[PDB]
Amino acid sequence: EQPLEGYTLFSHRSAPNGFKVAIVLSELGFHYNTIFLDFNLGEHRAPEFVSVNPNARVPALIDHGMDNLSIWESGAILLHLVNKYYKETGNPLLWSDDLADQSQINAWLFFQTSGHAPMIGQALHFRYFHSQKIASAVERYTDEVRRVYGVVEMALAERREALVMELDYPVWLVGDKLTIADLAFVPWNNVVDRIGINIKIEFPEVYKWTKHMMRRPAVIKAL
Amino acid sequence: VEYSRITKFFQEQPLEGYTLFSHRSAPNGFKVAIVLSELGFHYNTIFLDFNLGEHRAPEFVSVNPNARVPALIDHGMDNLSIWESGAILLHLVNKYYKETGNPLLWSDDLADQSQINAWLFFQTSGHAPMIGQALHFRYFHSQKIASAVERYTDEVRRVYGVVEMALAERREALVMELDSRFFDYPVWLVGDKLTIADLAFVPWNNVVDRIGINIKIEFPEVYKWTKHMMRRPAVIKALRG
Ligand SMILES: N[C@@H](CCC(=O)N[C@@H](CS)C(=O)NCC(=O)O)C(=O)O
């Protein structure tokens, strides 16, 4: 009894990557169900779900309208959603119709899913869940996460500079418009204080940037 | 620190073509070269000397903020600059497609592009990073942490199991599709054709021995999969160049 249209999102109550898909889905006006799996009971490893996501992790998204197509990596899901919306509307919302812009959005998106999220996750593990407490390991990742934020900080700082040379405004990573590249960081920005990173104090531009995204109803509507 | 050489480059950039900033010991650097080669895109490679801090060159950091390799400059597109191996592959297959109409190593169907993307993000997010951490604690950390090594080594084997399970399922599909003597026919991750999804793993598959993983014995399907790709000329030329 699978739906004819719409979407179903598998996630976790604590998953920042799961929230990343919820935000995009709501921002694009797509209709969706949300099934939160309970890891403790190994629902993310049960056959029926590995059939959906071979990697057995959330998020995962079933595009009912597309014959129950399963897209499983959070980054792949975003690319699917913005591609789907552009194709249906002709409007590259949170995306771009220009190939050069697309390459940039993807650059920041891969940077986020591959160099920002994993590092924050390793920082969280060694600090709260490792079988042993090792500071060198915790420091390795908190340091790397700070380097990453320094990268986005420097980027936004230059977008700011450019804007100012154009005599209080929001600045974005690509094409001076909100995109999945910017939204990909939101769920994680909101949790790094758990590893001792105070964005407000340490990364001013990132603080503004993230403040602008948290004030969006579509980002609140699902958080 | 001396990057005068890198600064000179950004003063005189070719009309068109591609310049690739890589490093001889960077698997993702070669992932790009492979695809670049498979698509017939002519490119020159500059191996950044991190020891000399060339990656700190203002002209390089401008083109690529994360100051890490690989990074590709598309001189034909006003010297556009893509800085993530995953974003570089997508740019290449897309550019190739609109220029020829033949989605080589790609797909023209949205559903297939999504499946390819899944495996691509997976390799860049769950594959490469975990192998990186495994190598780090095994050989480069300031101290020895056995548990940290076991953790990432366990994860690298887990992610390989996923690819193995996936390739095994594709195998059975093709077997019970005309039948066995078809136990060594080439199998691919999506659409029964080689795509950037399969190619993304090869440079790294050759590195996992350093962390004690033996693909040929522990992951048979992954082994056949790697060998088929390894015998392609474009591949050989890339890993060799
Ligand atoms: N690269 C993946 C990461 C997926 C991921 O880390 N999922 C977590 C959510 S916190 C999960 O399922 N954790 C359960 C587990 O590790 O057992 C993506 O962005 O989709």
Residues A151, A169: Cα–Cα separation, whole Å: 20
The token duo for B64 is: 């690529």
Quick one: DSSP state of residue B222? H
Which H/E stretch holds residue A202?
helix A199-202
Residues B151, B100: Cα–Cα separation, whole Å: 45
Annotated ligand binding at B55? The verdict is yes
Q: Scan residues 137-166 of A and list those with Cβ closer than 8 Å to B.
A: 137, 140, 148, 151, 154-155
| B66 with A111: Cβ contact below 8 A | yes
| B118 with A66: Cβ contact below 8 A | no
Residues A114, A91: Cα–Cα separation, whole Å: 28
Residues A69, A215: Cα–Cα separation, whole Å: 32
**Rg over CA atoms, chain B:** 19
A117–B contact, CB cutoff 8 A? yes
Annotated ligand binding at B68? The verdict is yes
Angstroms from A218 CA to nearest CA on chain B: 24
Specify the 3-state DSSP secondary structure of B46.
Answer: strand
Method: X-ray
Residues B55, A2: Cα–Cα separation, whole Å: 51
Residues of A in contact with B143 (CB under 8 A): 136
Specify the 3-state DSSP secondary structure of B24.
Answer: coil
Quick one: DSSP state of residue B52? G
| A100 with B77: Cβ contact below 8 A | yes
> What φ, ψ does residue A9 adopt, rounded to 5°?
-110, 120
Per the annotation, where are the binding residues of A? 17, 44, 57-58, 73-74
Angstroms from A49 CA to nearest CA on chain B: 13
Among A10, A11, A12, A17, the mutation site with the greatest number of ligand 1 atoms within 8 A of its Cβ is A17
A51–B contact, CB cutoff 8 A? no
Residues A19, A184: Cα–Cα separation, whole Å: 9
Q: Which of B121, B124, B156 to mutate to test the interface with A (most CBs of A within 10 A)?
A: B121
In whole angstroms, how far apart are CA B101 and each of A83, B4, B43, B106, B108?
19, 41, 22, 11, 9
Instruction: Report CA(A44)–ligand 1 centroid distance (Å).
Output: 10
CA of A76, closest atom in ligand 1:
20
Which residues 6+ apart lie within 8 Å of B203 measured at CB? Answer: B27, B28, B30, B31, B34, B239
Q: Which residue of B has its CA nearest to A138?
A: B148
Residues A205, A124: Cα–Cα separation, whole Å: 24
CB B85 within 8 A of CB A41: no
Which H/E stretch holds residue A87?
helix A74-89
CB A196 within 8 A of CB A202: no
Ligand 1 neighbours, Cβ below 6 Å, are A 12, 15, 17, 39, 44, 57-59, 73-75, 113; B 125-126
B132–A contact, CB cutoff 8 A? no
User: What was the resolution (in A) of this experimentally determined structure?
Assistant: 2.5
Of the candidates A73, A115, A134, A144, the residue with the CA atom closest to the CA atom of residue B145 = A134
Residues of A in contact with B113 (CB under 8 A): 79-80, 83
Specify the 3-state DSSP secondary structure of A8.
Answer: strand
The alpha carbon dihedral of A101, B93, A106, A96 has a sign of positive
Q: Which of B84, B114, B159 sits opposite A111 (nearest CB)?
A: B84
Of the candidates A96, A139, A109, A148, the residue with the CA atom closest to the CA atom of residue A17 = A109
In whole angstroms, how far apart are CA B166 and each of B118, B135, B161?
13, 25, 8
Instruction: Report CA(B126)–ligand 1 centroid distance (Å).
Output: 9
Which H/E stretch holds residue B81?
strand B80-82
Q: Over the range A90-100, which residues count as b (16 or more CB within 10 Å of their CB) and which as e? A: eebbbbbeeeb
Residues B149, B124: Cα–Cα separation, whole Å: 20
Residues B190, B112: Cα–Cα separation, whole Å: 7
Residues A120, A26: Cα–Cα separation, whole Å: 25
The alpha carbon dihedral of A147, A152, A155, A158 has a sign of negative
Q: Which residue CA neighbors atom 2 of ligand 1 most closely?
A: A73
Q: Which domains does chain A have, with CATH numbers?
A: 1-89 (3.40.30.10), 90-222 (1.20.1050.10)
Angstroms from B91 CA to nearest CA on chain A: 6
CB A71 within 8 A of CB B118: yes
